[PDB]
Amino acid sequence: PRLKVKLVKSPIGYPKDQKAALKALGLRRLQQERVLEDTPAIRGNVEKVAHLVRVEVVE
Amino acid sequence: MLMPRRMKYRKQQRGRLKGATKGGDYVAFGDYGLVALEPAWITAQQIEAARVAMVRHFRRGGKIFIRIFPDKPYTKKPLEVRMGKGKGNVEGYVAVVKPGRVMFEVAGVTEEQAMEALRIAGHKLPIKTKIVRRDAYDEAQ
Amino acid sequence: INPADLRIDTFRSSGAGGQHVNTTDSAIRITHLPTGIVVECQDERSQHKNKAKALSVLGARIHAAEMAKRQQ
Amino acid sequence: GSTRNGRDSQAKRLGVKRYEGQVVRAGNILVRQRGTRFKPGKNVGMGRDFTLFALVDGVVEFQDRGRLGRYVHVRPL
Amino acid sequence: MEYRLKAYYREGEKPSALRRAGKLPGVMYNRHLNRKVYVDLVEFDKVFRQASIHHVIVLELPDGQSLPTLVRQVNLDKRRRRPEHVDFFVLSDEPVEMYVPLRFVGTPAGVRAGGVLQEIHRDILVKVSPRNIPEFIEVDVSGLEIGDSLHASDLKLPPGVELAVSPEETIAAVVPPEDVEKLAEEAAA
Amino acid sequence: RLTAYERRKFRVRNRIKRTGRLRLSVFRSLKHIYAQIIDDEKGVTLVSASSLALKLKGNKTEVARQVGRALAEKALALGIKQVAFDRGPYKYHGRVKALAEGAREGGLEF
RNA sequence: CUGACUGGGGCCUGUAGAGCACUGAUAGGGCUAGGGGGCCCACCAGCCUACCAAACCCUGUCAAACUCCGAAGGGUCCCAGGUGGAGCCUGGGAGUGAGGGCGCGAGCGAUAACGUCCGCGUCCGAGCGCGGGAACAACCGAGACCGCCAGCUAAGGCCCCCAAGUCUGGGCUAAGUGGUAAAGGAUGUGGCGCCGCGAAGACAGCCAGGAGGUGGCUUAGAAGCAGCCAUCCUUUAAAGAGUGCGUAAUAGCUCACUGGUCGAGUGGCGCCGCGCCGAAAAUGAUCGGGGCUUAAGCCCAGCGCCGAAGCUGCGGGUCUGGG
RNA sequence: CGCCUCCUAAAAGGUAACGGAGGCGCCCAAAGGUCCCCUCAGGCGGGACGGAAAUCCGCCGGAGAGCGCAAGGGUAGAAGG
RNA sequence: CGAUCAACGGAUAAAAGUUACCCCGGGGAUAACAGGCUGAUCUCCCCCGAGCGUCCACAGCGGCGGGGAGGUUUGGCACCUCGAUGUCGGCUCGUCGCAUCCUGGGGCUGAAGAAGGUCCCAAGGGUUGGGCUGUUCGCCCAUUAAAGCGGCACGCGAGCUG
RNA sequence: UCCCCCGUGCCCAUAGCGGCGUGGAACCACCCGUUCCCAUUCCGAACACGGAAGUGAAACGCGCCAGCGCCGAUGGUACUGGGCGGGCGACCGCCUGGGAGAGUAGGUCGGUGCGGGGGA
Ligand SMILES: [Mg+2]
Ligand SMILES: [Mg+2]
Ligand SMILES: [Mg+2]
Ligand SMILES: [Mg+2]
Ligand SMILES: [Mg+2]
Ligand SMILES: [Mg+2]
Ligand SMILES: [Mg+2]
Ligand SMILES: [Mg+2]
Ligand SMILES: [Mg+2]
Ligand SMILES: [Mg+2]
Ligand SMILES: [Mg+2]
Ligand SMILES: [Mg+2]
Ligand SMILES: [Mg+2]
Ligand SMILES: [Mg+2]
Ligand SMILES: [Mg+2]
Ligand SMILES: [Mg+2]
Ligand SMILES: [Mg+2]
Ligand SMILES: [Mg+2]
Ligand SMILES: [Mg+2]
Ligand SMILES: [Mg+2]
Ligand SMILES: [Mg+2]
Ligand SMILES: [Mg+2]
Ligand SMILES: [Mg+2]
Ligand SMILES: [Mg+2]
Ligand SMILES: [Mg+2]
Ligand SMILES: [Mg+2]
Ligand SMILES: [Mg+2]
Ligand SMILES: [Mg+2]
Ligand SMILES: [Mg+2]
Ligand SMILES: [Mg+2]
Ligand SMILES: [Mg+2]
Ligand SMILES: [Mg+2]
Ligand SMILES: [Mg+2]
Ligand SMILES: [Mg+2]
Ligand SMILES: [Mg+2]
Ligand SMILES: [Mg+2]
Ligand SMILES: [Mg+2]
Ligand SMILES: [Mg+2]
Ligand SMILES: [Mg+2]
Ligand SMILES: [Mg+2]
Ligand SMILES: [Mg+2]
Ligand SMILES: [Mg+2]
Ligand SMILES: [Mg+2]
Ligand SMILES: [Mg+2]
Ligand SMILES: [Mg+2]
Ligand SMILES: [Mg+2]
Ligand SMILES: [Mg+2]
Ligand SMILES: [Mg+2]
Ligand SMILES: [Mg+2]
Ligand SMILES: [Mg+2]
Ligand SMILES: [Mg+2]
Ligand SMILES: [Mg+2]
Ligand SMILES: [Mg+2]
Ligand SMILES: [Mg+2]
Ligand SMILES: [Mg+2]
Ligand SMILES: [Mg+2]
Ligand SMILES: [Mg+2]
Ligand SMILES: [Mg+2]
Ligand SMILES: [Mg+2]
Ligand SMILES: [Mg+2]
Ligand SMILES: [Mg+2]
Ligand SMILES: [Mg+2]
Ligand SMILES: [Mg+2]
Ligand SMILES: [Mg+2]
Ligand SMILES: [Mg+2]
Ligand SMILES: [Mg+2]
Ligand SMILES: [Mg+2]
Ligand SMILES: [Mg+2]
Ligand SMILES: [Mg+2]
Ligand SMILES: [Mg+2]
Ligand SMILES: [Mg+2]
Ligand SMILES: [Mg+2]
Ligand SMILES: [Mg+2]
Ligand SMILES: [Mg+2]
Ligand SMILES: [Mg+2]
Ligand SMILES: [Mg+2]
Ligand SMILES: [Mg+2]
Ligand SMILES: [Mg+2]
Ligand SMILES: [Mg+2]
Ligand SMILES: [Mg+2]
Ligand SMILES: [Mg+2]
Ligand SMILES: [Mg+2]
Ligand SMILES: [Mg+2]
Ligand SMILES: [Mg+2]
Ligand SMILES: [Mg+2]
Ligand SMILES: [Mg+2]
Ligand SMILES: [Mg+2]
Ligand SMILES: [Mg+2]
Ligand SMILES: [Mg+2]
Ligand SMILES: [Mg+2]
Ligand SMILES: [Mg+2]
Ligand SMILES: [Mg+2]
Ligand SMILES: [Mg+2]
Ligand SMILES: [Mg+2]
Ligand SMILES: [Mg+2]
Ligand SMILES: [Mg+2]
Ligand SMILES: [Mg+2]
Ligand SMILES: [Mg+2]
Ligand SMILES: [Mg+2]
Ligand SMILES: [Mg+2]
Ligand SMILES: [Mg+2]
Ligand SMILES: [Mg+2]
Ligand SMILES: [Mg+2]
Ligand SMILES: [Mg+2]
Ligand SMILES: [Mg+2]
Ligand SMILES: [Mg+2]
Ligand SMILES: [Mg+2]
Ligand SMILES: [Mg+2]
Ligand SMILES: [Mg+2]
Ligand SMILES: [Mg+2]
Ligand SMILES: [Mg+2]
Ligand SMILES: [Mg+2]
Ligand SMILES: [Mg+2]
Ligand SMILES: [Mg+2]
Ligand SMILES: [Mg+2]
Ligand SMILES: [Mg+2]
Ligand SMILES: [Mg+2]
Ligand SMILES: [Mg+2]
Ligand SMILES: [Mg+2]
Ligand SMILES: [Mg+2]
Ligand SMILES: [Mg+2]
Ligand SMILES: [Mg+2]
Ligand SMILES: [Mg+2]
Ligand SMILES: [Mg+2]
Ligand SMILES: [Mg+2]
Ligand SMILES: [Mg+2]
Ligand SMILES: [Mg+2]
Ligand SMILES: [Mg+2]
Ligand SMILES: [Mg+2]
Ligand SMILES: [Mg+2]
Ligand SMILES: [Mg+2]
Ligand SMILES: [Mg+2]
Ligand SMILES: [Mg+2]
Ligand SMILES: [Mg+2]
Ligand SMILES: [Mg+2]
Ligand SMILES: [Mg+2]
Ligand SMILES: [Mg+2]
Ligand SMILES: [Mg+2]
Ligand SMILES: [Mg+2]
Ligand SMILES: [Mg+2]
Ligand SMILES: [Mg+2]
Ligand SMILES: [Mg+2]
Ligand SMILES: [Mg+2]
Ligand SMILES: [Mg+2]
Ligand SMILES: [Mg+2]
Ligand SMILES: [Mg+2]
Ligand SMILES: [Mg+2]
Ligand SMILES: [Mg+2]
Ligand SMILES: [Mg+2]
Ligand SMILES: [Mg+2]
Ligand SMILES: [Mg+2]
Ligand SMILES: [Mg+2]
Ligand SMILES: [Mg+2]
Ligand SMILES: [Mg+2]
Ligand SMILES: [Mg+2]
Ligand SMILES: [Mg+2]
Ligand SMILES: [Mg+2]
Ligand SMILES: [Mg+2]
Ligand SMILES: [Mg+2]
Ligand SMILES: [Mg+2]
Ligand SMILES: [Mg+2]
Ligand SMILES: [Mg+2]
Ligand SMILES: [Mg+2]
Ligand SMILES: [Mg+2]
Ligand SMILES: [Mg+2]
Ligand SMILES: [Mg+2]
Ligand SMILES: [Mg+2]
Ligand SMILES: [Mg+2]
Ligand SMILES: [Mg+2]
Ligand SMILES: [Mg+2]
Ligand SMILES: [Mg+2]
Ligand SMILES: [Mg+2]
Ligand SMILES: [Mg+2]
Ligand SMILES: [Mg+2]
Ligand SMILES: [Mg+2]
Ligand SMILES: [Mg+2]
Ligand SMILES: [Mg+2]
Ligand SMILES: [Mg+2]
Ligand SMILES: [Mg+2]
Ligand SMILES: [Mg+2]
Ligand SMILES: [Mg+2]
Ligand SMILES: [Mg+2]
Ligand SMILES: [Mg+2]
Ligand SMILES: [Mg+2]
Ligand SMILES: [Mg+2]
Ligand SMILES: [Mg+2]
Ligand SMILES: [Mg+2]
Ligand SMILES: [Mg+2]
Ligand SMILES: [Mg+2]
Ligand SMILES: [Mg+2]
Ligand SMILES: [Mg+2]
Ligand SMILES: [Mg+2]
Ligand SMILES: [Mg+2]
Ligand SMILES: [Mg+2]
Ligand SMILES: [Mg+2]
Ligand SMILES: [Mg+2]
Ligand SMILES: [Mg+2]
Ligand SMILES: [Mg+2]
Ligand SMILES: [Mg+2]
Ligand SMILES: [Mg+2]
Ligand SMILES: [Mg+2]
Ligand SMILES: [Mg+2]
Ligand SMILES: [Mg+2]
Ligand SMILES: [Mg+2]
Ligand SMILES: [Mg+2]
Ligand SMILES: [Mg+2]
Ligand SMILES: [Mg+2]
Ligand SMILES: [Mg+2]
Ligand SMILES: [Mg+2]
Ligand SMILES: [Mg+2]
Ligand SMILES: [Mg+2]
Ligand SMILES: [Mg+2]
Ligand SMILES: [Mg+2]
Ligand SMILES: [Mg+2]
Ligand SMILES: [Mg+2]
Ligand SMILES: [Mg+2]
Ligand SMILES: [Mg+2]
Ligand SMILES: [Mg+2]
Ligand SMILES: [Mg+2]
Ligand SMILES: [Mg+2]
Ligand SMILES: [Mg+2]
Ligand SMILES: [Mg+2]
Ligand SMILES: [Mg+2]
Ligand SMILES: [Mg+2]
Ligand SMILES: [Mg+2]
Ligand SMILES: [Mg+2]
């Protein structure tokens, strides 16, 4: 199981720890998509920035 | 009028007015009650004006229960001074009241009398109020 | 001193000061209508400290005048 | 108008300095406290100001003994 | 006398959703059972305003059962002054502690003199059998002057019902009335 | 509500337990005297001795001494050498003292 | 590879909330010291209470410097994910040590200030570059390497100024409310729910009566509109010992009330919706304008589109990295 | 105007204002070390002078006393006598 | 060992004032004027109807309390201006607001008439001369339909006065 | 490894208060003495020593009783990390994760380790 994570809302104005969560997920630009293994540590950061992000389950 | 006989501290920080009442939200003594719909600091002079209004309507007879007490000192700096130089002097006392509080209760009086007295009393208070009647819901508390 | 019988008159001062005197009023005169006793105080700068002295003196004249009509 | 208050003393930075499961060396201060809010347990000494400190190299362990108080122990490694 | 109230079982439905649908969430329990239930708010209100915590309410469950209950507890919305939850105590053949209405018979002599009858307790806490629940307990207050009082020791109890509060607990008092003639001394106090 | 006996017992014992030595506890009844060597870390008794178990007879003091010598002989058999004396609620004197002295004569270290 | 952030686990905490066991506050009862006022007395004992009122008890509450309780979180350590203009170490060079608005949490202030002082965060500062908000540093959208007469979106919008629906389904509002406010007042209007009264015929109109004992604590001469204590009953509808004009004397008119009428509903609560009043300040007005009323307003449910220097496409530069 | 205690301080630490309240500039040759022993305040009853409270007797009693002085923490299983 | 070096990280072993006779360098980082934000105070309007008004809550009043409006008072704050925004009063010249002093219209009156009181509409025009005082204001004289209250940098000193 | 008792721990009131009952063979206690060791700011009360006539009265042990004390759900709520909205404000909501205190039902007159002495 994997997660397709798309950054859809800008982190400008959001706390720096949410900005860091994006960095841990490797999301650096709007509309950028990353396919990450579904582990609890990755899921925790995806959930932290859920309001900025669009998630899909893949394969 | 109402104020503490003594206190540990002369002056209190202002604090906040969030939320519904902590307690005192059910009729506990009389047959009818005046319930607060909005939060406010209710002054001792407002309380007394409400009381006197009710005894004036009853003329003779009935019983009033005052369920709020102004124990919070109210502070004001002398007129025309600048900021600083310490906290202003105590000028009065207030009872903190939040939505749902039963502030006054009446008994020993007809429904028409209780409705009218509590209405007049409500006009002396800086908040919106509601008149209620003792219920099984109150008795179950 | 029941106020409904008071006519408070705020105007400008007279004499030493600065721009403050020319602009800031703070000259007070109260008038007790039932007795006709008037008092104006123009000592310190602020009218509130000028009204305080004006109030206490007005009552002092009200009492000294009634105590006259009583011992007369 | 003036104030007769305006005083306060320096903050004393009290509290637990090493939590349960931390690897300490002998002498490591474990708790700064006023009185015995924590009591010295196995391999833990107490100084004249109630400071708890490790007597041996080891691992910190806490224990709540009800009416007997809370204790701080060091478990040798 | 005895009231009936249709109840329904609930599992994971959110209390807010139920309450927005007009359903009053609740629970029913005793030493043997514990079930999450809900009742129609207006239907419950019609009953409870009569039954209160004094009279038996039997709940007609959807599985065909019918359990005799007393309301143990009603949680009120402090702001809106409305019920948000009910505890239904499922009765059984054992004696049970409960509140029994006090009915104040007579007009106190103090009341005739202008006083006011302060009804400190409008019910009394009691151990009794479910088969044995009286509807009220009469109290003769006509002897009370300003300011005399009655206590739970003065209660004449029907057969099979035992006081569950201290007999020292005061239950009624006749107090002096409000009087405008006192206002002036209070104002100049 | 504790008694002087209970407080005195806790007082002297707590002090002993802090040193972490094996604890030589002594119980003294009107007739008999008993001793057990206790590992308070495991909550277990290692070796025991008493006048009631040895069927000792005479003067209570000379008896106590004998139960002390007995406890020592068995203790050394287990390799128990160093110990800490738990007089409990008793003064270090008379029967308790005699038992202690008898334990020492046997080569118990304290 | 140790970083920010994240997962699991251990431990530390006394805030929100709440509570009243402690410290104090506290209303009303009970119970009862102490007084107070009255009784009988001074023979010193003896009785009253609706005065004040400790302790205690009950009901009911209040607290930054109260806590029997007590979260969400926060901190820290271990293992793990995390290769980032991350981190650690040693040196060279600094600049800054006037901040500011906003959100949340408090103090101060007046539950004032484009106020002030801290905490967490954020943005401007330095992003007065870009889209929206009429205009506008910090609100919303979004981090501008250059080029394009290409595409997709964000907030916001889609009647004309002005790019895109005079789009679709059901409501609400008549106030230009929308497009500037409160206590309070109102047969504005709409929607639920729950009780009265209805052919021994209702509500509303017309019609006939609407009485008799007839005074009291009782008086400033007023049985009934004078202040209370009053609420018995009766002349075979059965009509208050009384709500609106005369009254420190009487009329008379009137209801509630009863019958007589016509023939169909009528009245009372309670929750919600949207509107009316309250609503007066100084150069000329206006919601940005024009204009808008089954809307071009508000609520709900939809599909489409416009919309930026965000994203994509194409081409180019530069640095770093990987070949 | 330096130092201590409590609060403000937003449950780690720290955190400002001419914010809310109090203390310190000493003290003890024992009020220190160590052994040993002992347990308080208060309430009720009893009791010559003698009282609300001197000391004595009894019962009730987990700490509300004490710990040199402010406050807090701590404390009788003593840090108290 | 000698510190109220207590301004307590302690400039010298050793130290107070005054300046309208004043000076320079700076600051709108900071006050006095005006503005601005705020509206405590101020002015005005309401809600409640206790009681007054011989009788009668509301002709006229409105105990104790409650809600607002205005931005003319005194303040609070320190936001533009200290490489300058000239500050009172008078004169001249106006113009605006209406919470209206008069004049016009109207409702209630405890409106007989006349004359009043009070509230509603209404800003078209009008709103005198003089004594005192630097005065604004206020008192007084003689009149008047009336002798209104405010804004305009408490309008107006590149218009005057001083 | 079962029951009683005597030591000593652990959990830290579900273990406590009170009431009642029960136990002396053994053990423990009171008890009998104060010569001796040791002791009383006076007192053999305590501490201590030598004892064994008596009693389980006191204490302690073991049962029972829910008047008190203690413990205490399940529901629901407050509050809230994160995410959003509304109000001019005092303040009010929605989503997602967390989730009390009070109160109700109920529970409790203890459980357990080691070593002794005794009993089956
Ligand atoms: Mg964003
Ligand atoms: Mg970005
Ligand atoms: Mg943003
Ligand atoms: Mg965050
Ligand atoms: Mg964080
Ligand atoms: Mg981007
Ligand atoms: Mg998306
Ligand atoms: Mg504050
Ligand atoms: Mg106030
Ligand atoms: Mg204040
Ligand atoms: Mg000033
Ligand atoms: Mg201040
Ligand atoms: Mg103040
Ligand atoms: Mg006040
Ligand atoms: Mg309240
Ligand atoms: Mg009101
Ligand atoms: Mg309660
Ligand atoms: Mg002069
Ligand atoms: Mg001025
Ligand atoms: Mg001025
Ligand atoms: Mg001072
Ligand atoms: Mg201070
Ligand atoms: Mg200081
Ligand atoms: Mg500090
Ligand atoms: Mg500090
Ligand atoms: Mg501190
Ligand atoms: Mg700590
Ligand atoms: Mg250990
Ligand atoms: Mg040491
Ligand atoms: Mg020390
Ligand atoms: Mg552990
Ligand atoms: Mg309802
Ligand atoms: Mg790594
Ligand atoms: Mg790490
Ligand atoms: Mg880390
Ligand atoms: Mg983590
Ligand atoms: Mg709180
Ligand atoms: Mg309390
Ligand atoms: Mg309680
Ligand atoms: Mg509070
Ligand atoms: Mg509280
Ligand atoms: Mg606090
Ligand atoms: Mg608190
Ligand atoms: Mg708890
Ligand atoms: Mg936590
Ligand atoms: Mg953790
Ligand atoms: Mg790793
Ligand atoms: Mg690197
Ligand atoms: Mg960088
Ligand atoms: Mg960097
Ligand atoms: Mg360099
Ligand atoms: Mg260089
Ligand atoms: Mg610098
Ligand atoms: Mg520098
Ligand atoms: Mg500096
Ligand atoms: Mg600055
Ligand atoms: Mg600075
Ligand atoms: Mg700052
Ligand atoms: Mg600053
Ligand atoms: Mg802010
Ligand atoms: Mg918000
Ligand atoms: Mg604060
Ligand atoms: Mg600021
Ligand atoms: Mg602000
Ligand atoms: Mg503020
Ligand atoms: Mg900031
Ligand atoms: Mg700068
Ligand atoms: Mg920006
Ligand atoms: Mg930036
Ligand atoms: Mg910008
Ligand atoms: Mg800009
Ligand atoms: Mg632009
Ligand atoms: Mg912009
Ligand atoms: Mg724009
Ligand atoms: Mg535009
Ligand atoms: Mg802008
Ligand atoms: Mg860029
Ligand atoms: Mg498109
Ligand atoms: Mg537009
Ligand atoms: Mg177009
Ligand atoms: Mg649309
Ligand atoms: Mg259309
Ligand atoms: Mg409009
Ligand atoms: Mg409009
Ligand atoms: Mg309203
Ligand atoms: Mg009549
Ligand atoms: Mg009469
Ligand atoms: Mg309506
Ligand atoms: Mg209006
Ligand atoms: Mg209008
Ligand atoms: Mg439509
Ligand atoms: Mg575009
Ligand atoms: Mg780009
Ligand atoms: Mg390219
Ligand atoms: Mg490139
Ligand atoms: Mg680069
Ligand atoms: Mg702190
Ligand atoms: Mg703190
Ligand atoms: Mg802290
Ligand atoms: Mg914190
Ligand atoms: Mg001082
Ligand atoms: Mg000594
Ligand atoms: Mg000594
Ligand atoms: Mg005593
Ligand atoms: Mg006595
Ligand atoms: Mg005596
Ligand atoms: Mg005595
Ligand atoms: Mg103490
Ligand atoms: Mg002191
Ligand atoms: Mg020197
Ligand atoms: Mg000093
Ligand atoms: Mg200095
Ligand atoms: Mg100096
Ligand atoms: Mg110093
Ligand atoms: Mg210094
Ligand atoms: Mg320092
Ligand atoms: Mg020097
Ligand atoms: Mg020097
Ligand atoms: Mg020298
Ligand atoms: Mg000097
Ligand atoms: Mg000089
Ligand atoms: Mg001079
Ligand atoms: Mg001079
Ligand atoms: Mg001169
Ligand atoms: Mg000269
Ligand atoms: Mg010269
Ligand atoms: Mg000269
Ligand atoms: Mg010069
Ligand atoms: Mg110069
Ligand atoms: Mg210079
Ligand atoms: Mg210069
Ligand atoms: Mg300025
Ligand atoms: Mg400065
Ligand atoms: Mg200034
Ligand atoms: Mg200035
Ligand atoms: Mg100025
Ligand atoms: Mg000024
Ligand atoms: Mg100016
Ligand atoms: Mg100014
Ligand atoms: Mg300006
Ligand atoms: Mg201006
Ligand atoms: Mg303003
Ligand atoms: Mg205002
Ligand atoms: Mg305003
Ligand atoms: Mg005001
Ligand atoms: Mg108004
Ligand atoms: Mg009215
Ligand atoms: Mg009258
Ligand atoms: Mg009238
Ligand atoms: Mg009246
Ligand atoms: Mg008034
Ligand atoms: Mg107000
Ligand atoms: Mg202004
Ligand atoms: Mg002004
Ligand atoms: Mg000012
Ligand atoms: Mg101003
Ligand atoms: Mg100022
Ligand atoms: Mg300024
Ligand atoms: Mg400035
Ligand atoms: Mg500033
Ligand atoms: Mg300047
Ligand atoms: Mg220039
Ligand atoms: Mg210039
Ligand atoms: Mg210039
Ligand atoms: Mg110039
Ligand atoms: Mg003008
Ligand atoms: Mg007008
Ligand atoms: Mg006119
Ligand atoms: Mg006219
Ligand atoms: Mg007339
Ligand atoms: Mg006339
Ligand atoms: Mg006329
Ligand atoms: Mg008229
Ligand atoms: Mg009118
Ligand atoms: Mg009108
Ligand atoms: Mg006009
Ligand atoms: Mg005009
Ligand atoms: Mg005019
Ligand atoms: Mg004139
Ligand atoms: Mg002349
Ligand atoms: Mg003149
Ligand atoms: Mg003049
Ligand atoms: Mg002249
Ligand atoms: Mg003048
Ligand atoms: Mg004059
Ligand atoms: Mg004339
Ligand atoms: Mg005329
Ligand atoms: Mg001015
Ligand atoms: Mg002006
Ligand atoms: Mg002028
Ligand atoms: Mg001017
Ligand atoms: Mg001028
Ligand atoms: Mg000039
Ligand atoms: Mg001039
Ligand atoms: Mg000019
Ligand atoms: Mg000029
Ligand atoms: Mg000019
Ligand atoms: Mg000019
Ligand atoms: Mg001139
Ligand atoms: Mg001159
Ligand atoms: Mg045992
Ligand atoms: Mg027992
Ligand atoms: Mg027996
Ligand atoms: Mg027993
Ligand atoms: Mg025996
Ligand atoms: Mg026997
Ligand atoms: Mg001998
Ligand atoms: Mg003896
Ligand atoms: Mg003995
Ligand atoms: Mg014997
Ligand atoms: Mg016994
Ligand atoms: Mg014993
Ligand atoms: Mg049981
Ligand atoms: Mg509970
Ligand atoms: Mg729960
Ligand atoms: Mg939140
Ligand atoms: Mg807020
Ligand atoms: Mg939630
Ligand atoms: Mg949840
Ligand atoms: Mg909680
Ligand atoms: Mg709970
Ligand atoms: Mg128990
Ligand atoms: Mg045990
Ligand atoms: Mg164990
Ligand atoms: Mg065993
Ligand atoms: Mg055995």
PDB file of C-alpha atoms in Angstrom, chain D residues 22-72:
ATOM      1  CA  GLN D  22      17.314   8.028  31.170  1.00  0.00           C
ATOM      2  CA  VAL D  23      20.910   6.827  31.440  1.00  0.00           C
ATOM      3  CA  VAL D  24      22.665   8.728  34.225  1.00  0.00           C
ATOM      4  CA  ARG D  25      26.178   8.739  35.657  1.00  0.00           C
ATOM      5  CA  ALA D  26      26.984   8.708  39.360  1.00  0.00           C
ATOM      6  CA  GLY D  27      26.472  12.223  40.690  1.00  0.00           C
ATOM      7  CA  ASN D  28      23.886  13.228  38.057  1.00  0.00           C
ATOM      8  CA  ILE D  29      21.291  15.476  39.639  1.00  0.00           C
ATOM      9  CA  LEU D  30      17.875  13.867  39.238  1.00  0.00           C
ATOM     10  CA  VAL D  31      15.480  16.255  41.028  1.00  0.00           C
ATOM     11  CA  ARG D  32      15.702  19.818  42.322  1.00  0.00           C
ATOM     12  CA  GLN D  33      12.939  20.372  44.865  1.00  0.00           C
ATOM     13  CA  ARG D  34      11.817  22.095  48.057  1.00  0.00           C
ATOM     14  CA  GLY D  35      11.325  19.448  50.686  1.00  0.00           C
ATOM     15  CA  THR D  36      10.783  15.838  49.703  1.00  0.00           C
ATOM     16  CA  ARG D  37       8.329  15.930  46.835  1.00  0.00           C
ATOM     17  CA  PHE D  38      10.334  12.898  45.698  1.00  0.00           C
ATOM     18  CA  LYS D  39      12.173  10.628  48.069  1.00  0.00           C
ATOM     19  CA  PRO D  40      15.565   9.008  47.410  1.00  0.00           C
ATOM     20  CA  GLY D  41      15.204   5.375  46.446  1.00  0.00           C
ATOM     21  CA  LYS D  42      17.693   2.670  45.555  1.00  0.00           C
ATOM     22  CA  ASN D  43      21.104   4.108  44.603  1.00  0.00           C
ATOM     23  CA  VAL D  44      19.872   7.693  45.087  1.00  0.00           C
ATOM     24  CA  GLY D  45      21.242  10.149  47.636  1.00  0.00           C
ATOM     25  CA  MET D  46      19.787  13.405  48.898  1.00  0.00           C
ATOM     26  CA  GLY D  47      21.623  16.653  49.535  1.00  0.00           C
ATOM     27  CA  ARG D  48      21.117  19.251  52.260  1.00  0.00           C
ATOM     28  CA  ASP D  49      18.686  21.125  49.962  1.00  0.00           C
ATOM     29  CA  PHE D  50      16.640  17.980  49.124  1.00  0.00           C
ATOM     30  CA  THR D  51      18.464  17.541  45.806  1.00  0.00           C
ATOM     31  CA  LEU D  52      18.199  13.957  44.561  1.00  0.00           C
ATOM     32  CA  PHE D  53      21.204  12.585  42.713  1.00  0.00           C
ATOM     33  CA  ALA D  54      22.422   9.276  41.330  1.00  0.00           C
ATOM     34  CA  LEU D  55      24.864   7.297  43.464  1.00  0.00           C
ATOM     35  CA  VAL D  56      25.730   4.840  40.658  1.00  0.00           C
ATOM     36  CA  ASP D  57      25.844   4.672  36.892  1.00  0.00           C
ATOM     37  CA  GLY D  58      22.522   3.336  35.699  1.00  0.00           C
ATOM     38  CA  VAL D  59      18.974   3.992  34.553  1.00  0.00           C
ATOM     39  CA  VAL D  60      16.437   6.192  36.332  1.00  0.00           C
ATOM     40  CA  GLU D  61      13.188   4.612  37.514  1.00  0.00           C
ATOM     41  CA  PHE D  62      10.278   6.311  39.285  1.00  0.00           C
ATOM     42  CA  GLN D  63       7.814   4.637  41.645  1.00  0.00           C
ATOM     43  CA  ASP D  64       4.623   5.890  43.316  1.00  0.00           C
ATOM     44  CA  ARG D  65       4.176   4.189  46.701  1.00  0.00           C
ATOM     45  CA  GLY D  66       0.895   5.836  47.711  1.00  0.00           C
ATOM     46  CA  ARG D  67       1.021   7.167  51.267  1.00  0.00           C
ATOM     47  CA  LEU D  68       4.727   6.247  51.376  1.00  0.00           C
ATOM     48  CA  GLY D  69       5.428   8.921  48.753  1.00  0.00           C
ATOM     49  CA  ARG D  70       6.963   8.997  45.315  1.00  0.00           C
ATOM     50  CA  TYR D  71      10.472   7.597  44.999  1.00  0.00           C
ATOM     51  CA  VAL D  72      13.303   7.933  42.487  1.00  0.00           C
TER      52      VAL D  72
END
